[PDB]
Design a protein around this ligand. Sequence first.
Ligand SMILES: *CC(=O)N1CCC(C(=O)N(C)C(C)C)CC1
Ligand SMILES: *CC(=O)N1CCC(C(=O)N(C)C(C)C)CC1
Lengths: 304, 304
Amino acid sequence: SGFRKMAFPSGKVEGCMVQVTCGTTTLNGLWLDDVVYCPRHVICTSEDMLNPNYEDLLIRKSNHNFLVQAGNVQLRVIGHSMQNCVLKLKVDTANPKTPKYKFVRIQPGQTFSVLACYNGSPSGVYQCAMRPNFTIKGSFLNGSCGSVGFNIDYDCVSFCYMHHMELPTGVHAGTDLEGNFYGPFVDRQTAQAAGTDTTITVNVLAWLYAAVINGDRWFLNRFTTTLNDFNLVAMKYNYEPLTQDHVDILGPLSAQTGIAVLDMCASLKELLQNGMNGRTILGSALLEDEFTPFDVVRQCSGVT
Amino acid sequence: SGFRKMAFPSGKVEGCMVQVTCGTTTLNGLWLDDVVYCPRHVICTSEDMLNPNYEDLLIRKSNHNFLVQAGNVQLRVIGHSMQNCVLKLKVDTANPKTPKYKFVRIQPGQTFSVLACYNGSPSGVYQCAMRPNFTIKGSFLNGSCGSVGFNIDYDCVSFCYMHHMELPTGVHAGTDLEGNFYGPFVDRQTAQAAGTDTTITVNVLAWLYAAVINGDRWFLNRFTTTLNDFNLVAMKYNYEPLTQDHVDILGPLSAQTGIAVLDMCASLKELLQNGMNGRTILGSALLEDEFTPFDVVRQCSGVT
Ligand SMILES: *CC(=O)N1CCC(C(=O)N(C)C(C)C)CC1
Ligand SMILES: *CC(=O)N1CCC(C(=O)N(C)C(C)C)CC1
């Protein structure tokens, strides 16, 4: 028993973190095979960040301007290209610690682990979700850019996020490893505001299943609901509308606990309308939406 | 900006996790140099767990009964001793991935990362504290025993916890790596109940500093207090009494924010007496006590 906000083990990704320096800017890169991935804004002066033309800024850059350091050993840059908002620096040496890996673009509501790095040195690991507004709620100081988010499928690391931007509201924006930003965000120091941070309904329900499974059951009630009735309450409370697909995804947890998804919806409804009344569920005083159904099954079954 | 519940990177500890099988029982071991550490209850049948005499049970065990498997490679056990509540199995091969390390017995209120393992395979990582009642609030299914808790001081892993016991209330008990349990707990399936789970006052104050530092300031008020006045309120709310030592420890965070520790105490006091009124601090609806002052400084400065 016990249910905790759990990151994947960081080992396989630690061995992929390098320091990238361009001019006076130092941030983090991902070394997979003979390529280092990093945010293209490594080339910018704070001045440039206001309205940078990245193609033009890049012309003033050669392979030898990108200083790449794996721990205390320098890597020879033999090539550099811009893919969308990332730089791919070709090095002469393939990372000997490259795991099996994919680049995956995750949907909002999907969760991943972030290995926060400074100067290509890992400092910590924590679990995130891609918010429905395409922000993430990270911990990123200066030097943390190029820190990546990932899932591990046993041995295969699916890289889903590279950190680029802090919005003035202290939320975080970044790219998949093909350099495409999540949501409407850009590597420009401009007026960019996050949209509504909606709650990931399916994730809250998963976490309610997780709680029942771990003995926190006080919020089970006698009521059921429909998708249409439940969604009226979702709407009012800035929750993602719940689909039959979400219901299907919660099936396995339904099965295990013998609680119909819609009964659990009715529990969530009451919790939204009435709050917690100063009570806690899995040591939390609000409704956690950064566990997927998959995260719950994983941690409640014990997959490695 | 951003402040998240952050575990140390797991890499250095992943390379220390092995599977230990004795008879039908499989759990996790820590391989440092030519020694594998594991909970002595690996030798018990569920039957034995009711009133085991570990010295006597051990006599029926030889080196060759302890099957030790690092990934897919078996280790030859050439020795086995009981230290308190741990077994130390001497293997013929020193772990090539042994980091610099210490064994440290942590005080309650001190935080550490747990690498949850099943069959010596890491599944996830999460941050904990040693609770003032000497429980921890983990995520541990069957097979998770021998999972360890640790701090990293740059390159030196301080191992502070090995997981042994789930109490029927779903909280967790274990040993330092010398085999001595935290608190009054024993490796016996008996009536063991956790004492009062008091809140770690100094940790809540650190986390209040962390919030100010990250722009969550609504709970700053016009009031100050004394240790003696504040402690009256602590008492009533099952908070650790605050000492001058706690105040001294919060000095650096005081300095940085220019908020006197006692003013921040007065903020905590109001929060205790009045609650949150449905507001959140660093995305939390209750007062977080599993960040130390040291954890806050680390994550707010960006140490690796
Ligand atoms: C996130 C990160 O590590 N990063 C982005 C900001 C950058 C900086 O301080 N500025 C504004 C200049 C472009 C140097 C440092 C790298
Ligand atoms: C925690 C763990 O992995 N562990 C302790 C319980 C044990 C078990 O299932 N029992 C009760 C018997 C002693 C086999 C498995 C190992």
